Design a protein around this nucleic acid. Structure first.
Ligand SMILES: [Zn+2]
Lengths: 92, 261, 665, 50, 169
DNA sequence: ACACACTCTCCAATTCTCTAA
């Protein structure tokens, strides 16, 4: 056979390298200010998400990363279990 | 069969070109200078078109001063700085006016092919030396002077081409050349796939007259301790064989860039 | 066989000379043509070659033969024009029947050869083979017919009509009425022939104007000039306006619909109203060109392309990247963008309409067609007199036909009706917006109850069977009716009509419609948006409302709005005003903030708001920056109150009962 | 309001109100222009006679 | 196929170009009949048919080239002269195939002496130097004068692409 | 034999459609 293709998958997201890093650091990473423009602060938010997306899975263009995430995010039950777990933690 | 239309084909269009086209149209209509002797509108460019009709000519001469004073000069600026972009639109503008006032000129018995009009300009503001040609001015409108040193014989240049397939009875028409001899990409009949063995139909295709000439700097203009530079110039249409070796001439046109074919 | 084929071609060629010829005694250099004999049989047999053979075998070979021997251009036009000019001189003074017989039968062939072309999966392989070439020859036909003596054959065709206008309807035999159908059937073709559409067999993934044809020969501009000089517009105007008085409506009023479609098609109404001028706007456009040039310059390095050094960028966790070029040294935004731009893949992509001629339904209409001044004023005069004279009487007849015949319809007649309605209603609204001499009463037949039912029924039936092109046109027609209603309410029965228009069933349909738009072409989504704006604005001025607005707000509508909004480089200034009006409605008024916290919106606002996209001084930036400020304020508040939304922002919202309620609020 | 009636239109419809040398030479000549072949056969038969 | 045109019917070029009109079978047959009728019939003022007298001497010298004066061809059947000036490469093929019929009328079995005859045109009524030639002259017949500067040796050349050759220089 | 240009083929990745809980 030819070599099988490599893809983004929920296992990467649920890995310790994955989504927990964002929740462990996002409060410290991003910072808005009224003292800078909308365009300024708006640009700032995307920095962290871009660098994190590269570190996670360098295949593809940033937009493609988001739009790929939509499919697995809506379909996989284990990922959804993790997400309802987050919002239960806030219900705790 | 899996027949399919190019549903998506609707093209992108340059608004500046269409506006320049139908502004140059109005200039040709109504430049409306008064008579040399009296305060009466004469409309010289319409008269020049009528003159061309009388003698079956193919070229029209325009004065850059007349264009400079038109519509606060913006039209003259667009023509001056971006001649290579706007030359087809100027041709389209003139074709309509000649149709309107002298449709006998549109053709060159069986059917008669269309006349390839030539626009010409003169009395530009300043003349450059061969030593002043610099790559920042590529594609602009200029005028140059020097002494002729060589001329080539007149040769036919392929302008528009037409081909027919060997493996099936099919024809391709109005193929566009630019700098190298160029041929079709597919057999248009889907019953055949042969790309080879095209032949150029010399009757249906169209040619132009072409001549190469070579010039060098005027001796009285050479700077201190230096020697004269040279340049190659292209002549086409009704201006071939006008130049003579050893004479002094003034030229106008656009400078271009030619590849390694 | 090939020899049988050429035998028929030769038979035709001999018939192409038995017809007659000009006179070489004449010493008149040249004279006109001169007439043969058996020529009745010649014309009749040619008619048989079309009907009895080519139609029965489904070929178009016979048409190829007559095009080879140039019959139309060479004989038919001078036979007709000589008949016309002879009878004209006789009328100036103020067997002959046989001459008139020849005039009739030449015209009927002109209709046949210029008849427009249709291709399907049931057309013969012969026709499919010949489609592309006969297109070229019909283009030649259009140019020629408009050219001869500045178009004088068109006076022959209307003189034929004038014979049958002449004497009372009470006398007029069925054979007689066919002439009055035939003449109008001719002008439809002459307007309908236009430059070809390229088509190929999809076996492998890898212009059609002939050498004697050009655009100015073929443009709609030309056709206006040609009809005006040759006295057509008076005929269409007189004939349509006295239509109610006992001309048998049945024979005329569909052909006479198709004309009005076939040259309203490809005009934007604003081009007919102005709202040195050409030179002034050209200079302004050159300023815009300079701004684009400035944008390129701001991304251009000072020193040359081989001077360039090398750059390294270090992340958190001490890992390093490499990028080249001299601007990357100073601009991190550019370095970040340039870094991702190298990467190869793009996800491959998905794609609604076929079978009918180019129109508003499947082309970008931000592209005018161009008029002489005399043409502009003559066209304005023709349709203005049409509207003030003919429109109500035409619509009343054609609509009370179609209610009795809806089941039998074909896709084209549906798309004609819906794009004749739309054009004329909009143009009148615009004209009276401009000036007080105009009035809205002129188009007022559209509102009465029968037509409202019919536009509704077309939209209904088209939607259910998933026919998306009729659904698209019906969307355009139903938009205008609502627009006209809001006009008239800004001045009795109209409220009754509203209440019936906004029964619950229709709200289900009109709510449903933007949701499916996400898949389809850029026009479809734009129709959905403009209809939605109108639909909500009427019900705002009804005063029910809270039920209806909550019906609209959900994920699959928002998806469509963003998917449309990101192609803003192609769209108008006005449409973006409409989109942000809707986001103001979702975000501020309804207070359903949770829909828009989704990442591909946040990307979009950077692109569009950057020095990249929307101009620094267009009115759009006022709205956009005023929106984003408020957006990010509310987002700040939400994120600090509940940090889980950092992982929320990537994904759709979560539809579980127990956690989802707190999630959304 | 307009009307554009029939009877007006019928009434108004009618009342309203160098190879350049050689080519011409040959065209005009073309427009202007067994016993006949006996001279040929006579030249053939003179070989028999002489 | 069977029917033929009149000479007056050829006054109107009916196709989109000259070459595509000459090459049609009925037109070509008409031209062939007319050329043969000219060659068998043209006379001096004294009668004394010149071409019957030239074909006679063609065999007397065992020759291969028949010579035709252009003025004679322009003096009657003028349209054929016009077509010859416009499309020589077609017209001369038809004219050669007529000349063989005319020569075999004098000398049957001349095909055993030479298989094919060439018509030579003389006294073409317009002249250019090597200055005045332009792209419009392409594929037209021309008449030119000058000095012969250089000459190659004679070689054989393959005639058809069993084999046949011809001389070349 | 050593880089290239071009052709051919198979296989699995992807999206679309139907069914039942
Ligand atoms: Zn082919």
């Amino acid at each position: 056979k030819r070599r099988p293709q490599v893809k983004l998958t929920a296992e990467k997201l649920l890995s310790d390298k994955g989504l927990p890093y964002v929740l462990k650091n996002a409060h410290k990473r991003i910072r808005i200010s009224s003292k800078k423009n909308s365009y300024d602060n708006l640009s700032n938010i995307i920095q962290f998400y871009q660098l994190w997306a590269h570190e996670l899975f360098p295949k593809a263009k940033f937009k493609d990363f988001m739009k790929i995430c939509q499919t697995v995010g809506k379909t996989d039950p284990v990922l959804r279990e993790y997400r309802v777990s987050l919002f239960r933690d806030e219900m705790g | 069969f899996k027949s399919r239309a190019l549903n998506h084909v609707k093209k992108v269009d340059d608004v500046t070109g269409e506006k320049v086209r139908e502004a140059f149209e109005q200039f040709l209509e109504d430049f409306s200078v008064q008579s040399t002797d009296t305060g009466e509108v004469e409309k010289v460019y319409r008269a020049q078109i009528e003159f061309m009709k009388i003698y079956d000519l193919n070229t029209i001469y325009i004065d850059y001063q007349h264009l400079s004073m038109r519509e606060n000069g913006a039209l003259a600026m667009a023509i001056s700085e971006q001649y290579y972009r706007f030359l087809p639109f100027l041709q389209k503008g003139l074709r309509r006016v000649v149709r309107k006032y002298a449709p006998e000129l549109l053709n060159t018995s069986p059917e008669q092919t269309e006349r390839v009009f030539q626009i010409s300009f003169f009395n530009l503001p300043t003349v450059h030396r061969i030593r002043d040609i610099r790559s920042e001015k590529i594609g602009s409108l200029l005028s140059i002077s020097g002494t002729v040193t060589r001329t080539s014989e007149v040769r036919p240049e392929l302008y528009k081409a037409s081909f027919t397939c060997d493996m099936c009875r099919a024809i391709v028409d109005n193929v566009e050349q630019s700098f190298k001899y160029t041929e079709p990409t597919f057999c248009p009949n889907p019953s055949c796939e042969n790309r080879a063995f095209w032949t150029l139909n010399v009757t249906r295709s169209r040619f132009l007259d072409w001549q190469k000439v070579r010039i060098q700097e005027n001796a009285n203009e050479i700077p201190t301790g230096s020697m004269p530079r040279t340049l190659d110039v292209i002549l086409r249409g009704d201006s071939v064989e006008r130049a003579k070796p050893g004479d002094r001439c003034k030229f106008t046109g656009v400078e271009i860039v030619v590849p390694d074919v | 066989a090939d020899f049988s084929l050429t035998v028929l071609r030769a038979r035709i060629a001999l018939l192409a000379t038995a017809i007659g010829g000009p006179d070489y005694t004449s010493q008149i250099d040249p004279p006109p043509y001169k007439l043969g004999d058996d020529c009745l049989a010649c014309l009749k047999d040619l008619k048989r070659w079309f009907k009895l053979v080519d139609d029965q075998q489904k070929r178009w070979d016979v048409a190829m033969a007559v095009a080879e021997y140039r019959i139309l251009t060479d004989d038919l036009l001078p036979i007709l024009i000589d008949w016309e000019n002879k009878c004209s001189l006789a009328a100036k003074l103020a067997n002959k029947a046989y001459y008139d017989k020849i005039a009739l039968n030449c015209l009927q062939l002109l209709v046949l050869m210029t008849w427009p072309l249709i291709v399907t999966e049931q057309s013969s392989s012969n026709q499919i083979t010949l489609y592309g070439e006969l297109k070229k020859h019909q283009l030649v036909y259009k140019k020629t017919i408009l050219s001869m003596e500045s178009g004088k054959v068109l006076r022959a065709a209307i003189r034929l009509a004038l014979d049958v206008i002449k004497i009372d309807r009470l006398s007029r035999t069925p054979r007689d009425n066919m002439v009055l159908k035939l003449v109008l059937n001719f002008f439809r073709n002459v307007i309908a022939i236009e430059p070809g559409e390229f088509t190929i067999n999809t076996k492998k993934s890898m212009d059609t104007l002939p050498p004697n044809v050009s655009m100015d020969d073929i443009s709609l501009n030309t056709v206006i000039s040609s009809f005006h000089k040759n006295k057509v517009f008076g005929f269409l105007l007189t004939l349509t306006s006295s239509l109610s008085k006992e001309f048998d409506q049945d024979f005329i009023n569909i052909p006479l619909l198709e004309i009005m479609f076939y040259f309203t098609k490809d005009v934007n109404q604003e081009l007919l109203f102005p709202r040195t001028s050409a030179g002034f706007e050209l200079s302004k456009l050159l300023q815009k060109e300079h701004q684009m040039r400035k944008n390129v310059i701001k991304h251009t390095s000072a020193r040359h392309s081989r001077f360039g050094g090398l750059l390294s960028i270090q992340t958190p966790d001490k890992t390093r990247l490499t990028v080249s070029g001299s601007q990357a040294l100073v601009d991190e935004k550019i370095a970040l963008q340039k870094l991702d731009d190298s990467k190869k893949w793009n996800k491959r992509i998905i794609k609604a309409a076929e079978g009918l001629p180019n129109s508003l339904l499947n082309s970008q209409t931000g592209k005018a067609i161009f008029f002489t001044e005399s043409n502009g004023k003559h066209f304005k005069e023709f349709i203005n007199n049409f509207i003030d004279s003919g429109f109500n009487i035409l619509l009343h007849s054609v609509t009370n036909y179609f209610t009795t015949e809806q089941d039998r319809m074909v896709t084209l007649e549906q798309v004609e009706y819906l794009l004749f309605f739309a054009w004329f209603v909009k143009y009148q609204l615009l004209r009276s917006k401009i000036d007080n001499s105009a009035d809205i009463k002129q188009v007022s037949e559209a509102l009465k109850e029968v037509t409202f039912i019919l536009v509704s029924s077309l939209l209904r039936s088209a939607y259910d069977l998933k026919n998306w092109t009729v659904t698209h046109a019906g969307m355009i027609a139903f938009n205008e009716l609502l627009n006209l209603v809001s006009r008239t309410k800004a001045a009795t029965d109209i409220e009754f009509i509203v209440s019936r228009l906004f029964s619950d069933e229709r709200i289900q349909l009109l709510s449903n419609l933007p949701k499916i738009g996400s898949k389809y072409s850029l026009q479809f989504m734009k129709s959905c948006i403009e209809l939605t704006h109108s639909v909500l604005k009427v019900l705002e001025q009804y005063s029910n409302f809270q039920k209806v607005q909550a019906n609209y707000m959900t994920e699959p509508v928002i998806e469509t709005y963003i998917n449309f909004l990101e192609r803003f480089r192609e769209l108008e200034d006005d449409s973006i005003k409409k989109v942000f009006s809707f986001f103001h409605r979702v975000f501020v008024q309804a207070k359903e903030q949770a829909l828009l916290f989704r990442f591909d919106l946040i990307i979009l606002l950077r692109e569009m708001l950057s020095p990249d996209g929307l101009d620094r001084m267009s009115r759009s930036r006022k709205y956009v920056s005023q929106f984003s400020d408020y957006f990010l304020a509310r987002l700040k508040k939400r994120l600090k109150k509940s940090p889980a939304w950092f992982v929320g922002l990537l994904f759709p919202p979560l539809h579980n009962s127990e956690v989802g309620f707190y999630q959304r609020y | 309001k307009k009307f554009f009636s029939k009877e007006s239109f019928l009434a108004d419809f009618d009342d309203s109100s160098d190879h350049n040398v050689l080519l011409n030479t040959l065209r005009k000549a073309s427009r202007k222009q067994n016993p006949k072949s006996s001279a040929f056969f006579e030249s053939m038969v003179e070989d028999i006679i002489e | 196929l069977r029917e033929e045109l009149t000479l007056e019917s050829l006054s109107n070029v009916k196709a989109n170009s000259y070459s595509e009109w000459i090459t049609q079978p009925n037109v070509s047959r008409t031209i062939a009949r007319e050329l043969k009728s000219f060659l068998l019939e043209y006379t001096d003022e004294t009668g004394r048919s010149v071409y019957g007298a030239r074909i006679r001497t063609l065999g007397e010298m065992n020759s291969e080239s028949l010579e035709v004066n252009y003025r004679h061809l322009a003096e009657s059947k003028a349209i054929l002269a016009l077509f010859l000036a416009k499309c020589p490469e077609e017209m001369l093929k038809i004219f050669d195939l007529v000349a063989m019929e005319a020569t075999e009328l004098h000398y049957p079995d001349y095909a055993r002496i030479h298989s094919e005859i060439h018509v030579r045109i003389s006294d073409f009524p317009t002249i250019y130097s090597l200055r005045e030639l332009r792209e419009s002259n392409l594929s037209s017949l021309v008449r030119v004068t000058g000095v012969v500067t250089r000459r190659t040796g004679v070689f054989p050349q393959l005639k058809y692409v069993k084999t046949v050759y011809r001389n070349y220089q």
